putative cytochrome P450 125 (Mycobacterium tuberculosis), 414 residues
Amino acid sequence: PNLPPGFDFTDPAIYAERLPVAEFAELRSAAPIWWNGQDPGKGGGFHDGGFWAITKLNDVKEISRHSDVFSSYENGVIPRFKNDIAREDIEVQRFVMLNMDAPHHTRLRKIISRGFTPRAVGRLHDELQERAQKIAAEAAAAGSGDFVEQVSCELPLQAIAGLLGVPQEDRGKLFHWSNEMTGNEDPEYAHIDPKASSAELIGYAMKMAEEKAKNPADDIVTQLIQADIDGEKLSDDEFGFFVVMLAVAGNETTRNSITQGMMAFAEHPDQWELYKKVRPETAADEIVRWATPVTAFQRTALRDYELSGVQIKKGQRVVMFYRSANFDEEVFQDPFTFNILRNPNPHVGFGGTGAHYCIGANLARMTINLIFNAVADHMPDLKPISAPERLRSGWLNGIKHWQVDYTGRLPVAH
Ligand code: HEM
């Protein structure tokens, strides 16, 4: 393919500036499974010399379905850390369900599923709609400001707190810990240590589990720590690892779907007018496909496996570029058109179908719908002031800041 020598699709220096949309398109056309070599020292923590870049949706689905071959546990799913990360800090990811394989994954996923039933998630609708309205109103009253802080950040965190029944007076500290826990290489956050925040959150969660076992209630935490008919339940530490997992899994991801959904609405005012008018049930999925908050997750082959004519060898990493797959011209009609009516929309922003497919997908869609309803109600005319500031990460597609005029009336500053 026509790519610069040395090009690495996991390079956080790319994403601090842009999404490499042209280069993904070049691989889908010229080399849809492509060996991305990595130089000595520059492996993002993996010392294997490179990985297979997976760029087509059908191949992302195939890998995702064949979890008996393509393991999450062996090297975890994050394809990029600081280059000098210790191996034990990659392996500590195995304590959370996202980085487990069957059969251990299968048991935990069945228990954790109790928290994500339609009823469990449905129960959060009213508090989240009230909060979404309050968020948007307060931002509108500020006139202008950082959309990421003032509109995108809070609701995903309130969804996690509501789910876990975190007392109101504990939410600031919970959110503080959570916001320190999705590591990145961004110089703006170079002073933060995820490990200490993670240990505080796990201890807080374990105390909650102990208390709820003693005073069970009609809530999701009680369901998780009480034995079902098969005797299965989360131990206290397992409950702590579930909370730690959510603090990353359901935080920056939904946050970025909100920021980048609004960026797409600013870029496509026809879609924003359509949205405000009809508030269509298909909008959240198009927002997720367009935002693709997780650029990529990886797997490791547990045996040689041929994928679309390419021999993957045992031990090699494959990196599923959801950012590429979600724009695959053989699966979507006009993938580079932002269309909030798109249906079907077989995007992989929540992963390919398979064991690990996002268990929070419906909660995330509800979050997105409630906050955009509130934005439509309170700041229908909002206009950006300056360009988004992207996050330096080689796997998360993040926006740190985006200055916006909620009134739409401020004139151009010179
Ligand atoms: C738009 C927002 C979101 C996006 C783009 C997203 C994306 C993803 C992706 C790509 C995966 C891995 C899928 C795979 O490997 O096949 C995943 C897993 C997961 N997500 Fe989400 N997610 C979002 C919101 C949420 C929310 C709101 C929560 C919970 C509050 C959540 C909880 C989880 C959990 C617990 C896993 C692990 C599932 C497993 O390993 O079995 N996610 N998510």
Remarks:
- The longest strand covers residues 296-301.
- Residues 194-214 form the longest helix (21 residues).
- Residues 64, 97-98, 109, 160, 245-246, 249-250, 253-254, 257, 288, 293-294, 297, 349-352, 354, 356-360, 363-364 surround protoporphyrin IX containing FE (CB under 6 Å).
